[PDB]
Design a protein around this ligand. Structure first.
Ligand SMILES: CC(=O)N[C@@H]1[C@@H](O)[C@H](O)[C@@H](CO)O[C@H]1O
Ligand SMILES: CC(=O)N[C@@H]1[C@@H](O)[C@H](O)[C@@H](CO)O[C@H]1O
Ligand SMILES: CC(=O)N[C@@H]1[C@@H](O)[C@H](O)[C@@H](CO)O[C@H]1O
Ligand SMILES: *[C@@H]1O[C@H](CO)[C@@H](O)[C@H](O)[C@H]1NC(C)=O
Ligand SMILES: *[C@@H]1O[C@H](CO)[C@@H](O)[C@H](O)[C@H]1NC(C)=O
Ligand SMILES: *[C@@H]1O[C@H](CO)[C@@H](O)[C@H](O)[C@H]1NC(C)=O
Ligand SMILES: *[C@@H]1O[C@H](CO)[C@@H](O)[C@H](O)[C@H]1NC(C)=O
Ligand SMILES: *[C@@H]1O[C@H](CO)[C@@H](O)[C@H](O)[C@H]1NC(C)=O
Ligand SMILES: *[C@@H]1O[C@H](CO)[C@@H](O)[C@H](O)[C@H]1NC(C)=O
Ligand SMILES: *[C@@H]1O[C@H](CO)[C@@H](O)[C@H](O)[C@H]1NC(C)=O
Lengths: 74, 215, 160, 50, 148
């Protein structure tokens, strides 16, 4: 979902990259370091705009992160 | 036996009004002046699509069955008229080995002096029925002339059909992907057509998009 | 407790229709087509199975309403060129504007066969060509100075 | 009068042509494909129409 | 001179959408509003085909104690359309209504019906004390409790 013009719960409602993104996306598993502090959004009235953020909160859930956890790793 | 398609087996290919105008199209149409088989109830191939015509006096011809194996292994189209009402179904029927009329299920429906013309094709999961009814005065052949079959029925079957049979004269020809030029009157009805591969004059009329051409 | 499961083409949700309106530009849809146009009454006779109707070059120009068994002319929502008639800027900043073909309403106004002209005075005298407009009309900047529009003059007439 | 009607009819007819795109109808690229894909299809209709 | 600059175009005043008369409803009344509901050891099933499916009425109706969609969000159902659909219906204890979800476990989820973890559909339940319940007990209803 972390790529220009993607779709899915994050790319619609939580972290959106423009059609005209210009940058690099760099990522790694943190299972060996990271824990229900990490939330994400499931619901919204409409998509957020590219590089928007928000602080209203029911629309959110926690990720199932534990050091036991590949797609379910942090 | 075999007889002539003449200029019959043209139908309205889409749900669109056109008038005083000469429109070119490609669809499964009956090739002009091709041989049609003639029958006075065999299983027949369906191929890409059927043109079927039945000539009448006393309501002899009741309908058809369409599918592949036609004996309960898979779904199979039934189309019937009995006494005063049409019945249409698609079930996994245990049909007879040679069906005739005296004197798992997913879709069901219930409602020579004459000629009744039909075209059948199955495309993109949809069974299409086009037909025409007329009075006639002929025994030995289809009456040489032209008319267009309007669509009547548009069923989202999704059931592969490769063979068919008649339920009780009739005539059968097969549709092909040939280009047709179609002439519409001011009323919006198709009054003539050119099969654009019949002869070099038809190649000319369809290149020039006109039913009539200068020297 | 009573329970129902509805486990999930022929099963579609209820499509909502709007109330119909005529003789206005609208963002229309009928069944499977969409556009911008004017929906209007017509004398056309489509066959009962026909739902759209067509121009000579592929363009829809009529439809049959899916509830109302009468045929609509669809007329394109009106448009035209905006041409600006100006003296040279080393004279004045006044201008007159030609809305092409539209007949003076949809837009000190003068209907012509070239379109609606706005901001130029219709003068009964004819004069030579200074700025051309079309359909015999010209315009010029003349004296209290203004843009004037009139039928042009082909010459002084002479019975020989 | 024929050629100056025929080049117009030819140029109107080139609105129906696909030019290698998914479809020639402009609302039905947009109301089907997301903007990152819809622009790669509409760049075809623009190169064709132009 | 005269110059051409840009174009006049009237813009549309309002949005008009048109479809046929809203006939050929799915007979959800035979599934939600009936006089009789099934014994869970042998639950009822009905085809849904060739129809307008009024999911909107179900979503907005107050008669349900729980309603959920198990692979879709319940607002979309009014625009969605499907190849084939089936209703199932049955009657349960409140502490065993707690087995109606994708991939859940228990005697009903083992031996009296099953939904995939990848199940697609809308699932609903309501109180039936006023309708099903009898002062002696509903012994017409059964669970296939012990099944290998
Ligand atoms: C008018 C009449 O005789 N209708 C009958 C119908 O009742 C029967 O169910 C059907 C069986 O295919 O055949 C036809
Ligand atoms: C024919 C005419 O009007 N000519 C004048 C010119 O004499 C003047 O020097 C200039 C200043 O921009 O404006 C123009
Ligand atoms: C296709 C269809 O069912 N159309 C009906 C129409 O005949 C009737 O006059 C109208 C009454 O408001 O309701 C709608
Ligand atoms: C089949 O068509 C050809 C013309 O293409 C004709 O010569 C031939 O006699 C026809 N055959 C029969 C048996 O009708
Ligand atoms: C219907 O299809 C199923 C497989 O989906 C098969 O087990 C069953 O025997 C079929 N029913 C009939 C009447 O053939
Ligand atoms: C029709 O045949 C194709 C194979 O060409 C198959 O994939 C499809 O499932 C068949 N349809 C039905 C309804 O059996
Ligand atoms: C069209 O139909 C009308 C009857 O509504 C008839 O009078 C007219 O002659 C027909 N036009 C043609 C070209 O057949
Ligand atoms: C357009 O001009 C005609 C005369 O040709 C006139 O009858 C009509 O009312 C005019 N349109 C408007 C909107 O005034
Ligand atoms: C032109 O002259 C006629 C009388 O011949 C008069 O009715 C009309 O209003 C005049 N028009 C203008 C633009 O002066
Ligand atoms: C069932 O009937 C009730 C009548 O009170 C109605 O409110 C409800 O919407 C109906 N639901 C269905 C699916 O028919």
């Amino acid at each position: 979902q972390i790529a220009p013009g993607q779709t899915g719960k994050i790319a619609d409602y939580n972290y959106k990259l423009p059609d005209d993104f210009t940058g690099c996306v760099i990522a790694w598993n943190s299972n060996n370091l990271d824990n229900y502090n990490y939330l994400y959004r499931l619901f919204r009235k409409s998509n957020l705009k590219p590089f928007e953020r928000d602080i209203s909160t029911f629309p959110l859930q926690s990720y199932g992160f534990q050091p036991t956890n590949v797609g379910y790793q942090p | 036996a075999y007889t002539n398609s003449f200029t019959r087996g043209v139908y309205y290919p889409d749900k669109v009004f056109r008038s005083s105008v000469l429109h070119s199209t490609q669809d499964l149409f009956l090739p002009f002046f091709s041989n049609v088989t003639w029958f006075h109830n065999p299983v027949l191939p369906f191929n890409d699509g059927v043109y079927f015509a039945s000539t009448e006096k006393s309501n002899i011809i009741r309908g058809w069955i369409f599918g592949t194996t036609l004996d309960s292994k898979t779904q199979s189209l039934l189309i019937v008229n009995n006494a005063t009402n049409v019945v249409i179904k698609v079930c996994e029927f245990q049909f007879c080995n040679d069906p005739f009329l005296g004197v798992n299920c997913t879709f069901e429906y219930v409602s020579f002096k004459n000629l009744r013309e039909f075209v059948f094709k199955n495309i993109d999961g949809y069974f299409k029925i086009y037909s025409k009814h007329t009075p006639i005065n002929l025994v030995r052949d289809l009456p040489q002339g032209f008319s267009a079959l309007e669509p009547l029925v548009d069923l989202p079957i999704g059931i592969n059909i490769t063979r068919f049979q008649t339920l009780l004269a009739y005539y059968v020809g097969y549709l092909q992907p040939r280009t047709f030029l179609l002439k519409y009157n001011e009323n919006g009805t198709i009054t003539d057509a050119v099969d654009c591969a019949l002869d070099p004059l038809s190649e000319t009329k369809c290149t020039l998009k006109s039913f009539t051409v200068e020297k | 407790y009573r329970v129902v499961v509805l486990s999930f083409a022929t099963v579609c949700g209820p499509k909502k229709s709007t109330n119909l309106v005529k003789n206005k530009c609208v963002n229309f849809n009928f069944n499977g087509l969409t556009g911008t146009g004017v929906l209007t009454e017509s004398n056309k006779k489509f066959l009962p199975f026909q739902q759209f109707g067509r121009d000579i070059a592929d363009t829809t120009d009529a439809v049959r309403d899916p509830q109302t068994l009468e045929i609509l002319d669809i007329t394109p929502c009106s448009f035209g060129g905006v041409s600006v008639i100006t003296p040279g800027t080393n004279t004045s900043n006044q201008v007159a504007v030609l809305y092409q073909d539209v007949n003076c309403t949809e837009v000190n106004v003068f209907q012509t066969r070239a379109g609606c002209l706005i901001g130029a005075e219709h003068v009964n005298n004819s004069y030579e060509c200074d700025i051309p407009i079309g359909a015999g009309i010209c315009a010029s900047y003349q004296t209290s100075q203004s843009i004037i529009a009139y039928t042009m003059s082909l010459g002084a007439e002479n019975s020989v | 009068v024929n050629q100056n009607a025929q080049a117009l009819n030819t140029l109107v007819k080139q609105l129906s042509s696909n030019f290698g795109a998914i479809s020639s109808v402009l609302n039905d690229i947009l109301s089907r494909l997301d903007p990152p894909e819809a622009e790669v299809q509409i760049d075809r209709l623009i190169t064709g129409r132009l | 001179g005269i110059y051409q600059t840009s174009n006049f175009r009237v813009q549309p005043t309002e949005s008009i959408v048109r479809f046929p008369n809203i006939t050929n409803l799915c007979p959800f009344g035979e599934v939600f509003n009936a006089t009789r509901f099934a014994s869970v050891y042998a639950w009822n099933r009905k085809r849904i085909s060739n129809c307008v499916a009024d999911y909107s009425v179900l979503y907005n109706s107050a008669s349900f104690s729980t309603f959920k969609c198990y692979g879709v969000s319940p607002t979309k159902l009014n625009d969605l359309c499907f190849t084939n659909v089936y209703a199932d219906s049955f009657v349960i204890r409140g502490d065993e209504v707690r087995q109606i979800a994708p991939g859940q476990t228990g005697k009903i989820a083992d031996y009296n019906y099953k939904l995939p973890d990848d199940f697609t559909g809308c699932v609903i339940a309501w109180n039936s004390n006023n309708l099903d319940s009898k002062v002696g007990g509903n012994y017409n209803y059964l669970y296939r409790l012990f099944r290998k």
